[PDB]
Design a binder for this molecule. Sequence first.
Ligand SMILES: CSc1ncc(Cl)c(Nc2ccc3c(c2)CC(=O)N3)n1
Ligand SMILES: CSc1ncc(Cl)c(Nc2ccc3c(c2)CC(=O)N3)n1
Ligand SMILES: [Cl-]
Ligand SMILES: [Cl-]
Ligand SMILES: [Cl-]
Ligand SMILES: [Cl-]
Lengths: 123, 123, 4, 4
Amino acid sequence: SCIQFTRHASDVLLNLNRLRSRDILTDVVIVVSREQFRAHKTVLMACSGLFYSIFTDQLKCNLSVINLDPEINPEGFCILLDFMYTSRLNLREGNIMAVMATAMYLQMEHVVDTCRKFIKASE
Amino acid sequence: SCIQFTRHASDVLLNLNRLRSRDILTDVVIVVSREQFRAHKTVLMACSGLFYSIFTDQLKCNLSVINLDPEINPEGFCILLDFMYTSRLNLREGNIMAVMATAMYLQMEHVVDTCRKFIKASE
Amino acid sequence: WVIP
Amino acid sequence: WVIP
Ligand SMILES: CSc1ncc(Cl)c(Nc2ccc3c(c2)CC(=O)N3)n1
Ligand SMILES: CSc1ncc(Cl)c(Nc2ccc3c(c2)CC(=O)N3)n1
Ligand SMILES: [Cl-]
Ligand SMILES: [Cl-]
Ligand SMILES: [Cl-]
Ligand SMILES: [Cl-]
């Protein structure tokens, strides 16, 4: 018999992004080919199968620094980190290959799906 | 020129609630008249003006235990904590007064608004 | 607010 | 996915 507030999840995500922009309560640095990205472990886990697996590990859950595979492109990661905190994906002809490869590595199934569809349309 | 994934914010909140249910990466205990509630500081801040103010304080941001005012009803808090993580509010005739008072103290403006409207309809 |  |  609950009532539901339609905009609540969006408002929560908007506030989490405000915290990220002001570097409030960020608890991890993600290192991508020497570029560094500060974030909230819980948000990373909520968006990515890879971060979910990492931060549920009894040893890795306590790390303040995570280094990604050197093949990962920092711009592709930045675009995906922005998507995690906003639901908005900056998908462009020049970045789609790097974004899809990063989303496959991060295990972000819905992003991989839209990249596959956008690539298929251009062939 | 971004594309947007409609269900992303809801999916994020659903995963944050899964983390709460399994007590994963919870970093604070909220004490309400001896009842204890584990949660994520970032989610509490994203939903409540009171928690936002508390955890942006340079001393309180580091506390692992927060004690609420003894007038706060544990059931009212529990209902609001469930709403924070799900967008669903269990508003009932028997709890509406305790839920509204707790939402006013927590500074959850949209919850206060629907409680005022539901009370006004019954008068 | 809605009935979900 | 939509055009926001
Ligand atoms: C599976 S239960 C669960 N519980 C809590 C969290 Cl934080 C979580 N996250 C997560 C797991 C896998 C995937 C994603 C998020 C996005 C994606 O495409 N795959 N999962
Ligand atoms: C105001 S900027 C901002 N930035 C980040 C966060 Cl985490 C935040 N939360 C917050 C503040 C006030 C209120 C709520 C959440 C719910 C409500 O009714 N009032 N606010
Ligand atoms: Cl470390
Ligand atoms: Cl995704
Ligand atoms: Cl403490
Ligand atoms: Cl609210």
